[PDB]
RNA sequence: AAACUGAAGAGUUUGAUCAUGGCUCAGAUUGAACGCUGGCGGCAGGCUUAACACAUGCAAGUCGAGCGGUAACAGGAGAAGCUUGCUUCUUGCUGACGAGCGGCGGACGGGUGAGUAAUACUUAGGAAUCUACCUAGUAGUGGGGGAUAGCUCGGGGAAACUCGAAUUAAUACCGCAUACGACCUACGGGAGAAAGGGGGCUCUCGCUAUUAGAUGAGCCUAAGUCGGAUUAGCUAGAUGGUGGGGUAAAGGCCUACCAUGGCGACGAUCUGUAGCUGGUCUGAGAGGAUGAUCAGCCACACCGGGACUGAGACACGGCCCGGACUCCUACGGGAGGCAGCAGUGGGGAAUAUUGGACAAUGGGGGCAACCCUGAUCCAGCCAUGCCGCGUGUGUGAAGAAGGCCUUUUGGUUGUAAAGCACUUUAAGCAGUGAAGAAGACUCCGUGGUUAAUACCCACGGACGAUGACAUUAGCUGCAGAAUAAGCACCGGCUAACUCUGUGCCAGCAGCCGCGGUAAUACAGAGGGUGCAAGCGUUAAUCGGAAUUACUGGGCGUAAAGGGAGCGUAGGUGGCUCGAUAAGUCAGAUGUGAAAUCCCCGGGCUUAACCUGG
RNA sequence: GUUCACCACGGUGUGGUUGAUGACUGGGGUGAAGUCGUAACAAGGUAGCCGUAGGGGAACCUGCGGCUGGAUC
């Protein structure tokens, strides 16, 4: 299936072992799934601050 | 002991008949009562009993593959 | 043979047991004839520490039941008060 | 077998099975004499049959060879077959 | 867990004197606030919502009676379950509280402080009809008909409870509680009725809260 | 007295409207996973996928008071080399005890859910059976024989093991003698047992035949129990009968003959899927979904098949044959089965220790002493859940600084901080310290027994042998605020708003949608809101959905009356007087396991939890 | 021991059912300021629609019967 990488900036490319969620995204014609950011080989976002769980962003120190 | 009452339907076994008997179950959602009604087949030693009539069968020790009811009285005949 | 054991029950560290009539070779927590009591090993001076029916006990007795050595000493020590 | 008592229970059940299969095929072996008498219609000879396999049957019935039932089901139909074989 | 964070503003959002602080000042002056709820912008325009009068009643009480959303949601749950009318049985039920019982007592100045006593294991409880006291730290007990509370051997020279009693004099005592200052102790003859607690909390908006 | 209490809507079709109608959301729940974060405790729970393959250790033994005995160990008596206190060799003499014969156990307990749509399960009954150990009886336990394992002797084999000759004991085995019952009977009569051991002639543990209980097991009947008709006909031992066989027992369970039957639109047959129940989640309820943990039942034990022994098995850690796989081999042959408890590899999003003890409750063996028990009781790990507690408490304004906004001077963060005054829960340190233990053994007394003051049994006292957990729970001190806050969100639904950056990009999003140069919707800040050692997201179920409407909807035009009729099964059906009592209603009895749910209580410091009715 | 009977494995043949694939081909949907037209909505400029048949690049056109869910009358 094809799926979604949400946030500002990845570092997926082929090859990447990631995992996936569930979640459709309503613009995107056919995608159904969504990657889920710091899981396995999907970074999370660098400079996320906010909502930094949904990311996979370290608290900042 | 357990005595049922019904219909014989068939008597073409030897020493056997089957006996329609009805009851009424109630649909557990709707609460209408339908009629069901099993075949069970009894055993009539002497032969005697004809399709049409009435009959009382008690549970017993089975006499064979599907046959384990026995005749008790024929309360009603073909007329 | 019919027993009549502890069945345990309670919590961690809390143990409170029925007494019950089963057949031997069922799991001690598990199937039974005939619950005829308790007894709980932790209990207050001012509570029911231990309950049996005697009347069944009795009947059981004669009928083929044999107590474990923890029943017939909580039966022992529960009649002489 | 993984424990030396089930090793022992095997040996001792190989030694147990012989010894009441021989047994197991004498009743079997004084049953055939009355069936084959009964078979050519002769009283006289079922009946000699019959009287000379009652205390194997009831002997090897009380050893447990064969269930007590067993042995007073086949006396009692073999006596039935018999007796109206005229008696 | 507990609120750990500033009182003031916890009353400036609920719009009430809560009595997080204690009476030593009155609350218009210890806070020159309350006309507005916390942040840059407090009064508001866009009107509230059946939803927001629900809530903020809910939270009105949780932050009075210092008592999280799950403890009470299980109270809530007792309540409904109890016979009778449920904002009464709730607003029983969390006037029971051991820490609250010992701070309408007197013993502490505020119910933050009087749960911090409890806590730390300087008030005895002694249950209705038991011939003995058992120190307990935990707030949350509820106290039935005739319980007895009593200050700890070791803990009755303590100058906090001993400013706590003169600021519970000049506050009300309630006529269900039997405290006497000689030796530090109280009796909770009679969880308070509905006609003794205050008529300004709408328990009503909490029942409707708890129904979806 | 109580179990009798419970029901919310919103957004989105239009220029607007009302209706219809789908989509979406707010709730509850989990054996959860993931992301960010993370202090503690109690109680639970923890391979949901590969019934995939399994290294290693353990999960079933026990009895010498059945027997020959002596491999080991320890004693004892003598031989004493005596080396004078070194010390060895004979003996089963004793405590005991490997192997062996014999008994009981291994059919329990534990695991799994593959198969199974009905030899299953649930409810209610039934008759034609068997049942070790247990209880209460009854009639006995007499007298012989031939063997044989170990032990010998000689081989074969790499091992696994094995062959031959000789040969000993028994509660091993087989005759013979008797037989209250019991079995067969033509009812005149026929046949059929056993074994001894132990303590001082007795008692006791056994054995034999059997009766009645109890326990367990097998068997049968009726009702109920998933989806598909784009599966309608299915059955030839099939359906019934007799003679015979078979089984503990009814029965086509088997067989020879006789008849042509049996089942099906009340769904047979065939297909898909599935262990079933008590219960669990959800719901106002009715319903819907589901069948982890606990308990009951069933099925299975690498796969296919057969049976033996036994009271009980077609036997999880038994046997035989076949098979796949794995391993050993000297190439001839052998061995093995974690869906027991730990654990490994693998699969997976994901699920723990190769721990302790039999102290307790049970289970197996034993006369006991005692031995065994991965059941069980505990401990370890994991925020996986539930419940509880903490991360301080008061007081503190020219309302400090800093941050943010701002009209550039105010506002807000905010009594918040600093300062001062106290407190020490939990954690840390040091002490003390219940309860889980049932009082074994031994002594004394009493009663029963007896020929007996013995022995044995029962009862009554004295005695303190027995604790894995465990450095226990709890309780008392010491020190010092010291050791302890994060997560999501803030356009509306939906509680909480402003700046800066960006400029239909980067991005968000459950839905409506936002982003085009002044974005309360993106990203960061300040502020706030809700939860909090958790917070969100995803998956999944019910709810909202009266959106399959039984409770509780519709069909003129919104989706929806068959083109019309006749008619089969079926559904429904006038008046009056009777009978019956099946439906219906009421009463009684039996049952509807316990746990759970609910009510009233009781015990844990509270609560969760446990527990009585 | 032998032999027969029952029977597991395994084998042979011939069908059924169903998963994945397959050159090519049919229609459905999505996507931009594309090409051709303008069939429908007003009497939409030939009233529309239903069944059916024939025809046509394409919407469609025509015949036969039916309907009003047809304006102007």
Redesign the pocket.
């Known amino acids: 299936v094809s799926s979604y990488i ?4 990845h570092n997926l490319q082929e090859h990447s072992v990631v ?1 996936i ?9 056919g995608v159904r799934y ?1 990657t ?1 950011r ?3 080989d999907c970074a ?1 976002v660098k ?13 900042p120190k | ?2 005595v049922l009452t019904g219909r014989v339907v ?1 008597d ?5 008949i ?1 006996v329609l ?6 649909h ?14 009894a ?1 009539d030693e002497n032969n005697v009993c004809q399709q049409g009539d009435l009959v009382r069968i008690k ?11 026995t005749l008790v009285d024929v309360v009603e005949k073909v007329e | ?3 009549i ?14 007494v019950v009539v089963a ?9 039974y ?1 005939e ?1 005829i009591g ?1 007894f709980n ?2 209990a ?1 001076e ?3 520490a231990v ?1 049996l029916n005697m009347e069944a006990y009795h009947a059981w007795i ?5 107590p ?4 017939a ?2 039966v ?2 529960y009649n ?1 008060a | ?17 012989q ?3 021989s ?1 197991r095929s004498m009743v079997r072996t004084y ?1 055939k004499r009355v069936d084959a008498a009964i078979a050519a219609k002769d009283y006289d000879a079922a ?1 000699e049959a019959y ?1 000379k396999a ?2 194997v ?8 060879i ?18 109206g074989l005229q ?1 | ?9 916890l009353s ?2 609920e719009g009430t004197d809560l009595g ?3 009476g ?2 009155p609350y218009d002056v ?4 309350a006309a ?7 009064v ?1 325009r ?1 009107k ?5 009068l ?3 009643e ?2 009105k009480v ?1 932050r009075i009676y210092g008592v ?4 009470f949601a ?1 109270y809530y749950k007792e309540a ?4 009778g009318a449920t904002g009464e049985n709730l607003l029983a039920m969390l006037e029971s509280r051991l820490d609250n019982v010992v701070y309408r007592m007197g013993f502490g ?2 119910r ?2 009087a ?2 006593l ?5 008030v005895m ?1 002694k249950k209705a009809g038991r011939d003995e006291f ?9 106290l039935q008909d005739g319980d007895v509370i009593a200050i700890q051997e ?2 009755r020279e ?3 409870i001993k400013n706590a009693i003169e600021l519970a004099t000049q506050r009300g005592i309630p006529e269900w509680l039997d405290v006497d200052h000689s030796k530090l102790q109280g009796t909770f003859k009679k969880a308070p009725d509905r006609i003794d607690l205050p008529a300004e909390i709408n328990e009503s908006l909490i029942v ?2 708890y ?2």
Do not use: C
């Open positions: 949400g946030g500002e900036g995992l969620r569930g979640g459709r995204v309503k613009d995107l014609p969504h889920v710091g899981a396995l999370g400079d996320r601050k906010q909502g930094r769980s949904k990311y996979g962003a370290k608290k | 002991a357990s068939s073409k076994m030897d020493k056997s089957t008997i009805e009851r009424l179950v109630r557990p959602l709707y609460g209408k009562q339908l009629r069901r009604s099993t075949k069970i087949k055993h549970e017993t020790r089975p006499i064979s593959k599907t046959k384990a009811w | 043979m019919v027993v054991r502890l069945a345990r029950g309670g919590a961690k560290k809390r143990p409170f047991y029925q057949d031997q070779r069922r799991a001690r927590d598990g199937r004839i619950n308790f090993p932790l207050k001012s509570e029911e309950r004669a009928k083929g039941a044999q474990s050595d923890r029943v000493s909580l022992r020590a002489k | 077998a993984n424990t030396a008592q089930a090793r022992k229970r095997a040996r001792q059940n190989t030694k147990r099975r010894n009441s299969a047994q049953l009946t009287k009652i205390p049957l009831d002997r090897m019935a009380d050893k447990g064969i269930h007590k039932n067993k042995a007073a089901r086949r006396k009692s139909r073999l006596n039935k077959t018999i007796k008696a | 867990a507990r609120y750990i964070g500033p009182k003031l503003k400036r959002r997080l602080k204690s030593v000042k210890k806070t020159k606030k507005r709820p916390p942040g840059q912008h407090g508001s866009n509230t919502s059946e939803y927001a629900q809530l903020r809910k939270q949780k999280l959303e799950r403890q299980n409904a379950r109890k016979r100045s505020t933050a402080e749960r911090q409890v806590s730390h294991r300087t409880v058992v120190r307990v730290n935990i707030p949350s007990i509820q070791k803990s303590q100058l906090r409707e809260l129904s979806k």
